[PDB]
Write a protein that binds this ligand. Sequence first.
Ligand SMILES: N#Cc1cnn2c(Nc3ccc4c(c3)CC(=O)N4)cc(Cl)nc12
Ligand SMILES: N#Cc1cnn2c(Nc3ccc4c(c3)CC(=O)N4)cc(Cl)nc12
Ligand SMILES: [Cl-]
Ligand SMILES: [Cl-]
Lengths: 123, 123, 4, 4
Amino acid sequence: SCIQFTRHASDVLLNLNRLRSRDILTDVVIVVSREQFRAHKTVLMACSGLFYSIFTDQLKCNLSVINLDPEINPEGFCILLDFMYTSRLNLREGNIMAVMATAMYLQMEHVVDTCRKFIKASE
Amino acid sequence: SCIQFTRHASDVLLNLNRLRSRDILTDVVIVVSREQFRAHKTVLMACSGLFYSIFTDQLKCNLSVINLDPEINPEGFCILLDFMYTSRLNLREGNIMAVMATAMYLQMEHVVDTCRKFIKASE
Amino acid sequence: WVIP
Amino acid sequence: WVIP
Ligand SMILES: N#Cc1cnn2c(Nc3ccc4c(c3)CC(=O)N4)cc(Cl)nc12
Ligand SMILES: N#Cc1cnn2c(Nc3ccc4c(c3)CC(=O)N4)cc(Cl)nc12
Ligand SMILES: [Cl-]
Ligand SMILES: [Cl-]
C-alpha cells in the first residue's frame, strides 16, 4: 500500500554526484595509468560487476587504492565514472572503442549493449 | 550530446538498498530510543537536510554513532529510512503523525508535503 | 507522488 | 537509452 516519489532516485544520485565533486566521504582512489579518480565504494559496486566483486572481497574491501589493468584508458574510465554518478553517457565517435572496452572490463552490461548497437549502425 | 539510461538511478538505489540489507559498507548506526539502524552516511546526507548538516560537520562526520532526539518515534524513522533507500513511503492512518513529525525533524520536505496533503484531505 |  |  506504499506511495512512491518518482524523482527520489534521480535526486539521490544528483546528491551523490555533488558529494563526489566536493570530495566528501570518498573512500577509494581508482588508479588508471598516470591518472587518479576518487569515488565512493558503494556507488562503484552499485554500477559495476567488477567493483561489486572487488569490494565484497574480505581483503580488497579495506583497500584505499585500486589499480586497474594498464590496458584501461583513463578517458574511457572518466566517461564511465561520470555515467555511474549521473546516468549520462558522453558517447562519441572518437571515444566509443575505449568506452566499450572499459565497460566490458568494468562489467557494465547496459553500456556494452548500446556501444555494440552504435558500432553496428556505423558498419 | 550525452545519451541517458532512464533506469540507471533506480538501479543504483536498488543496489544501495541491497548493500544496506547485507550490512555491507554501512558506516553509521542511528540510535532512536531503544532501537538501532545501520546506514550509509552518503545516502542519509543525500535524502535529509538534517544528516547533510550533521555529516558535513568537521567533528560529527567521523562519528560511528548518532543519537536522535528522544521525541523521535523508531517506527517513523524506520519508514523514512526505507523511503530513503527505495523511493517508497509506507504512509498509513496509524503512522502518518509520527512519519510527518520525523520528516520535519529530518528535513525531508517532499515527505512533509505529502503528509500535509493527506491530513488536509481527512479533515 | 504516485501509486507504484 | 534516450536523448535527455
Ligand atoms: N549488496 C549489494 C550489491 C551492491 N552492488 N550490487 C550489484 N552490483 C552489480 C553487479 C553486476 C553488475 C552491475 C552491478 C551492473 C552490471 O552490468 N553488472 C549486484 C548485486 Cl546482485 N548486489 C549488489
Ligand atoms: N555534496 C553534497 C550533498 C549531499 N547531500 N546534499 C544535499 N542533501 C539534502 C539537503 C537538504 C534536503 C535534502 C537533501 C532533502 C530535503 O528535503 N532537504 C543537498 C546539497 Cl545542496 N548537497 C548535498
Ligand atoms: Cl551499465
Ligand atoms: Cl523527501
